[PDB]
Design a protein around this ligand. Structure first.
Ligand SMILES: *[C@@H]1O[C@H](CO)[C@@H](O)[C@H](O)[C@H]1NC(C)=O
Ligand SMILES: *[C@@H]1O[C@H](CO)[C@@H](O)[C@H](O)[C@H]1NC(C)=O
Ligand SMILES: *[C@@H]1O[C@H](CO)[C@@H](O)[C@H](O)[C@H]1NC(C)=O
Ligand SMILES: *[C@@H]1O[C@H](CO)[C@@H](O)[C@H](O)[C@H]1NC(C)=O
Ligand SMILES: *[C@@H]1O[C@H](CO)[C@@H](O)[C@H](O)[C@H]1NC(C)=O
Ligand SMILES: *[C@H]1O[C@H](CO)[C@@H](O)[C@H](O)[C@H]1NC(C)=O
Ligand SMILES: *[C@H]1O[C@H](CO)[C@@H](O)[C@H](O)[C@H]1NC(C)=O
Ligand SMILES: *[C@H]1O[C@H](CO)[C@@H](O)[C@H](O)[C@H]1NC(C)=O
Length: 611
């Protein structure tokens, strides 16, 4: 229950042998569980290492090399998990522990309780003064003996106490090696404390046991939940009999090493059912049910300084030297400016011009709290589709009353601000884009937030010379206009929408995947809803309880692929049978493996157990 990080220095040590010893002691001082590697190196002859008696478990490997002390005090080291291995091979490595051309050197191993090495091999050789080690039957300690090549122990040595002869860590009687796996009966799944069936330890017991219960283990094979060795921690979701579906489990626990905890350690957060340093890239840290945890994002939020804010205050424009400074940004706290100097750069003074493909970096942007000034753009780029996910332009700050500006650009035909829906404050100014159309089709008033917000549009390709040239808004679009060609470039849909695309109607009566309409938005019906023909809707809302008919079975109000077959419940596994009408009902509590019906005589049993 005391925890500490290990080290990964391997054969790296401090020149000052005094500081080395002091280092070791500071690290594993009163540590019971080393969540990493136990590395003991470059320690001199007379130094007491009695503080090492605190270590009961090591999840990584144990390295003992270049030492000179006499006795290794790890009499409490019960197990080494081998999550990491020395030289990618050993969970335990002991070598070259003697003074070159001297008399000092490791002589005895105090590993009286080392009965479990879950993963990896053992290397113990090149220890001039080491004794006894070779008497130990490592086959009983090392869980995975393959390749046998990786389990090597070789050795004026004393004798083992009469009580064991041939198998001891030292002369002390209580230092005789205790066998915990090889001496067991066939019936034992794992370890034992005697040669008889009644001596078998519980499945989840590592190292050995002092009893038959999963609470009598010396160490757990997987996790430790409140003293009980279990295969897994209380699940994050359990079946709720009233809602007829899995629900967040308020008793859920999380993994932290070999422990199940209710709350993760200080600098950790919950990701699914484990405790981690930081949330994975696809999730963000949030407070949910009084617990910090990682919730999947729908691109995760990431604020960034704009041109003229914070780390970019000196900047006057986005340029090749700060463009990568907007990677994965979602919200820009400030302005985004595009001046000629930034677009064309300055070759003579070695300042590269903006590489057009890198402008795709703004596709993640959804908001701009300030203004968007575009006085220059790559010649070959026809639109601003790199801003396709742009939703809001706050206009918190304005360029002399302007919140959006697009001047003198000749290489642009359309805007394509696909997701643009809000321009809080400031006025718009799109001028001198003789090749730009669609701009006249927009009802800018839709995007505004107040009456005190004007629009200024001048010498852009005449509405007429487009209107006639083929530059028209798709028919499936509202009278609010579009940002360019296609049904996926409109302000509002005329009929309905499926994603960013405007369409004629939802898949209400036909289609590969049936849908329901939610205020003009088409949403697919749950997969369990049976597709209905001849004018019948397949669903009237989302989820397995809003179907017209279930395609398989029905658990209470929910359409399910199959009735509950061993689902994790609050106190036990949930089982149900299906009546002739494919309706699910509870199995009798005495049926711990399923049933055919309600009766106590309707119990059925797993077909995959026993010979
Ligand atoms: C060895 O392990 C046993 C079983 O858990 C424990 O009771 C005892 O403290 C340990 N004995 C020694 C000599 O470390
Ligand atoms: C392990 O045995 C293989 C089999 O030939 C050999 O190639 C390898 O070098 C050996 N490694 C060790 C640590 O003995
Ligand atoms: C499990 O952890 C508890 C602390 O809650 C500890 O007292 C117990 O010895 C541990 N059990 C095993 C087998 O490690
Ligand atoms: C614009 O031209 C540049 C020339 O280097 C090219 O790399 C980029 O892909 C082009 N961008 C467009 C219009 O897709
Ligand atoms: C079922 O449909 C209703 C609307 O009819 C909706 O409000 C409810 O959330 C849906 N239930 C779910 C989420 O399965
Ligand atoms: C931003 O997220 C992307 C996608 O996960 C990743 O490739 C990139 O390294 C991240 N950059 C940052 C914010 O450091
Ligand atoms: C567009 O702006 C608002 C509604 O979006 C409304 O006041 C105005 O009449 C609309 N104009 C047209 C012709 O759709
Ligand atoms: C407008 O000028 C363009 C040349 O950019 C020409 O193709 C088009 O026919 C003209 N339309 C009119 C008559 O305004």
């Amino acid at each position: 229950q005391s925890v500490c990080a290990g080290t990964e220095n391997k054969l790296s040590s401090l020149s000052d042998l005094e500081q080395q010893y002091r280092a070791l002691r500071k690290y594993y001082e009163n540590c019971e569980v080393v969540m990493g590697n136990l590395e003991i190196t470059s320690i001199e002859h007379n130094r007491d290492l009695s503080f090492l008696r605190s270590v009961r478990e090591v999840t990584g490997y144990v390295l003992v090399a270049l030492n000179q002390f006499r006795y290794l005090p790890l009499e409490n080291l019960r197990i080494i998990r081998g999550t990491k291995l020395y030289e990618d091979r050993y969970a335990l490595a002991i070598f070259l522990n003697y003074r070159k051309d001297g008399n000092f050197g490791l002589q005895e191993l105090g590993l009286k309780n080392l009965t479990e090495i879950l993963n990896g091999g053992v290397y113990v050789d090149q220890n001039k003064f080491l004794c006894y080690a070779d008497t130990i039957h490592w086959q009983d300690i090392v869980r995975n003996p393959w390749p046998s090549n990786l389990t090597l122990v070789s050795t004026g040595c004393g004798r083992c106490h009469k009580s064991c002869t041939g198998r001891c860590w030292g002369p002390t009687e209580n230092h005789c090696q205790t066998l915990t796996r090889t001496v067991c009966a066939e019936q034992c799944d794992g370890r034992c404390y005697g040669p008889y069936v009644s001596d078998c330890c519980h499945r989840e017991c590592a190292g050995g046991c002092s009893g038959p219960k999963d609470t009598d283990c010396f160490a757990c094979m997987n996790f430790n939940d409140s003293g009980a060795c279990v295969t897994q921690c209380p699940q994050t979701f359990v079946y709720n009999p009233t809602t007829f579906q899995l629900e967040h489990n308020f008793n859920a626990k999380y993994t932290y090493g070999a422990f199940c905890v209710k709350k993760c350690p200080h600098n950790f957060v919950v990701d699914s059912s484990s405790c981690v340093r930081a949330c994975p890239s696809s999730k963000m840290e949030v407070e949910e049910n009084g617990i910090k945890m990682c919730k999947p994002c729908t691109i995760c939020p990431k604020a960034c300084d704009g041109i003229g804010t914070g780390s970019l205050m000196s900047a006057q424009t986005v340029d090749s030297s700060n463009i990568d400074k907007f990677i994965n940004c979602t919200k820009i706290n400030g302005n985004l400016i595009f001046l000629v100097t930034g677009i064309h750069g300055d070759p003579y003074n070695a300042i590269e011009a903006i590489d057009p493909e890198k402008l795709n970096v703004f596709r993640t942007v959804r908001e701009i709290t300030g203004f968007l000034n575009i006085q220059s753009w790559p010649p070959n780029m026809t639109d601003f589709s790199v801003f396709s996910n742009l939703v809001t332009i706050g206009g918190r700050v304005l360029y002399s009353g302007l919140s959006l500006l697009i001047l003198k650009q000749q290489g642009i035909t359309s805007l394509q601000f696909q997701s643009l829906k809000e321009i809080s404050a400031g006025n718009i100014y799109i001028t001198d884009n003789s090749n730009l159309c669609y701009y006249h089709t927009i009802n800018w008033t839709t995007l505004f937030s107040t009456i005190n917000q004007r629009i200024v549009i001048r010498d852009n390709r005449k509405a007429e010379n487009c209107t006639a040239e083929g530059m028209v808004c798709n028919h499936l679009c509202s009278s609010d206009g579009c940002w360019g060609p296609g049904p996926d470039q409109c302000l509002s849909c005329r009929r309905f929408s499926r994603g960013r695309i405007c369409i004629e109607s939802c898949n209400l009566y036909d289609g590969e995947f049936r849908e329901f309409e939610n205020d003009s938005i088409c949403v697919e019906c749950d997969p369990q809803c049976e597709k209905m023909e001849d004018g019948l809707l397949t669903c009237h809302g989302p989820g397995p309880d809003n179907c017209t008919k279930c395609s398989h079975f029905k658990d209470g109000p929910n359409c399910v692929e199959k009735c509950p077959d061993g689902l994790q419940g609050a106190n036990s596994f949930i089982f149900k049978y299906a009546d002739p009408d494919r309706e699910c009902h509870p199995c009798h509590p005495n049926c711990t493996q399923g049933c055919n019906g309600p009766t106590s005589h309707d119990c059925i049993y797993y077909p995959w157990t026993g010979h």
